[PDB]
Paper text:
Branched chain ketoacid dehydrogenase (BCKDH) controls the rate limiting step in BCAA degradation, the activity of which is inhibited by BCKDH kinase ([name])-mediated phosphorylation. BCKA flux through the complex is inhibited by E1α phosphorylation (Ser337 in the full-length human protein) by branched-chain ketoacid dehydrogenase kinase ([name] or [name]).
Additional SAR optimization was initiated on a less ligand efficient, structurally distinct screening hit, S3. To accommodate S3 binding, L128, R167 and R171 side chains adopt different rotamers than in the BT2 complex. The carboxylate also forms charged interactions with the side chains of R167 and polar interactions with the side chains of R171 and Y346 via water-mediated hydrogen bonds.
Numbering used by the authors:
A (entry chain A), B (entry chain A): 26 to 50, 54 to 306, 332 to 375
């Protein structure tokens, strides 16, 4: 479509987490919605550009074509909406944003299926990794903007949209610990206990949304490895130790397990999409998605394998405030 | 000299640690000495080539020139010796090797002084790091060959020259722990206790010589950081935890301290020669020498800083046997 061509070239306008805390007023609701209305089609068109740039044989896969078609229909639905002038115009847009978040819920699952089906034709090894990294980060960016504006309507305590003003890293870790242990216990009959140390009382403004994905994935990985390495003593398994290091530059969460580590042969494949050695696991998405997430947010995800003993996983996320 | 020109081009012949275990027979003494006699001048000439390749203004420094002159006189002394035919010819060579090890004892200290004096003229940032990395590794290579042949005369238990047949990583760590604590206690009035865990009963053939330098340097660093971060409670300081991970590919020694970590601003300078934030410390050689050492021996030295909490230092060394 010619309308998509125009918005693909248009540069992306990023709203810094520090700037995002401008929710005062309800004139602040209109100001935010007017931004969301202009910024959402640009992000969609940038991704349509990525589908258009895929090699022909891959872009032709019926599942890839379907996802491409979903992105085009999404851009159509969003741009057709008239500009926001009053609180009635702001209200109807929120319903399009909520529909966008539901119509595109399974885009990554269809994209992985389509890309996997096209294995025979994929020559560039990096092609799939870069396409999924770019898709996953754009979606996080869109979901961040969309959830933030939708959350501005609610009067959620300790939050300004999706920014928590008083986030405790200990609390968010604790939240996922019991959730991962319940999944682990289901498959292995037991789960390792988790110990949290370091800056346990650190409290700071932060966006928990990315941590809500990364932490359960990293805890599921650490727990599965601990269980698969202690199969002969499933009830006597070593604890997973999480350390919080909060400094003025970044937040570091180190997840140290005694699960035998990542084998030297698998060490270069663990960060590849679909690579697994196994619903908890048997997907191969946990690590590459978590790294793409951490890096998109000015951080990093680093692995330190001690083969025969365990692994230390270092999640770093840059603090809010420049 | 024209004789040096000839041996600079001659490729280096490396004796694999696995091959080195050929001490049988005393015809094995002659076979080894005949190799040492031919290989030692090649290693010296390769380094003379490095001095000849330094930029003129740097090579002209009187201290640099003196070290260059030491390498030339060393090559002269070694090549002038007649080939080894009998046990009297083998015996006299061992005295030249022992003299070589003493005449060149302070080469690195003079080289660092000369290179530091030439700071104003050094344009390439990597120049000093690569020169010292190459000097330190060549010396380790020469010292390995020289000490191995000299040790073949002794009947040291559990050793074949410099290869320990039954090395315990726990024991060698323990050996340096009390030594580093005594140095640390002298400056800070106390020292952190050290805890060793993991493959504590692992025993394997290995060359301890590089570990005899790396371990005390890494323990001195971890202990100094722990003391400087707990200055208000110098008698209540956290333990330094060393983990041994012995697998079929490599030996991993992780030294984890709660010494506040390496600051983000210093993180890229810590591996540079002379960089320090301070006879234990105030040298800036510990980290870059240890990494050059680990890498020369098919391993690595990796740092993981948790700013505000501590640092994890990962020493990896490839096992003996291909
Ligand atoms: N803590 C860990 N210890 C050992 N291996 C791990 C650990 N975390 C991840 N891995 C390895 O990395 C592979 C890929 O991980 P991930 O991307 O999370 O996928 P999945 O959990 O679906 O298998 C896993 O199958 C596993 O072999
Ligand atoms: N465990 C550690 N924790 C914190 N900082 C460290 C640690 N190890 C090294 N460093 C930093 O790296 C610098 C350089 O280390 P090194 O090369 O060992 O030199 P030196 O010990 O002579 O200062 C140190 O001055 C220190 O600031
Ligand atoms: C336009 C749009 C619609 C839905 C989304 C969603 N993203 C998620 C998600 C959450 C965690 C890890 C990955 C993902 C992922 O599918 O991208 C769920 S719905 C993002 C953008
Ligand atoms: C020909 C020759 C002579 C002496 C040597 C020595 N090397 C050391 C040493 C030990 C540990 C860390 C560094 C060094 C270092 O000075 O290279 C001491 S004497 C190496 C080669
Ligand atoms: K993976
Ligand atoms: K240093
Ligand atoms: Mg996973
Ligand atoms: Mg040191």
């Amino acid at each position: 479509q010619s309308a998509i061509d125009a918005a693909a070239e248009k540069p992306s306008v990023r709203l810094t987490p520090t700037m995002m805390l401008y929710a005062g007023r309800g004139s602040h609701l209109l100001k935010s919605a007017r931004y969301l209305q202009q910024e959402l089609p640009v992000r969609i068109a940038h991704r349509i550009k990525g589908f258009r740039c895929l090699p022909f044989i891959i872009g032709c896969n019926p599942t890839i074509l379907h996802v491409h078609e979903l992105y085009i229909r999404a851009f159509q639905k969003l741009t057709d909406f008239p500009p926001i002038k009053d609180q009635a115009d702001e209200a109807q847009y929120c319903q399009l944003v909520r529909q966008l978040l539901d119509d595109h819920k399974d885009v990554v699952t269809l994209l992985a299926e389509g890309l996997r089906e096209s294995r025979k034709h994929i020559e560039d090894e990096k092609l799939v990794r870069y396409f999924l990294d770019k898709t996953l980060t754009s979606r996080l960016g869109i979901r961040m903007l969309a959830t933030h504006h939708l959350a501005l309507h609610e009067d959620k305590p300790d939050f300004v949209g999706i920014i928590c003003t008083r986030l405790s890293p200990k609390k968010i870790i604790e939240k996922w610990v019991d959730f991962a242990r319940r999944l682990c216990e289901h498959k292995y009959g037991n789960a390792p206990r988790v110990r949290i140390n370091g800056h346990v009382a650190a409290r700071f403004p932060f966006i928990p949304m990315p941590l809500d994905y990364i932490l359960p994935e990293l805890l599921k990985n650490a727990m599965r490895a601990t269980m698969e390495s202690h199969l002969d003593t499933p009830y006597n398994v070593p604890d997973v130790v999480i350390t919080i290091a909060n400094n003025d530059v970044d937040l570091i969460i180190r997840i140290s397990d005694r699960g035998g580590g990542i084998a030297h042969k698998d060490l270069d494949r663990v960060m590849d999409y679909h690579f697994t050695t196994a619903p908890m696991h048997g997907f191969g998405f946990g690590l590459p998605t978590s790294r793409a997430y951490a890096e998109y947010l000015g951080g990093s995800l680093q692995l330190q394998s001690l083969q025969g003993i365990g692994t230390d996983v270092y999640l770093r996320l840059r603090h809010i405030d420049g």
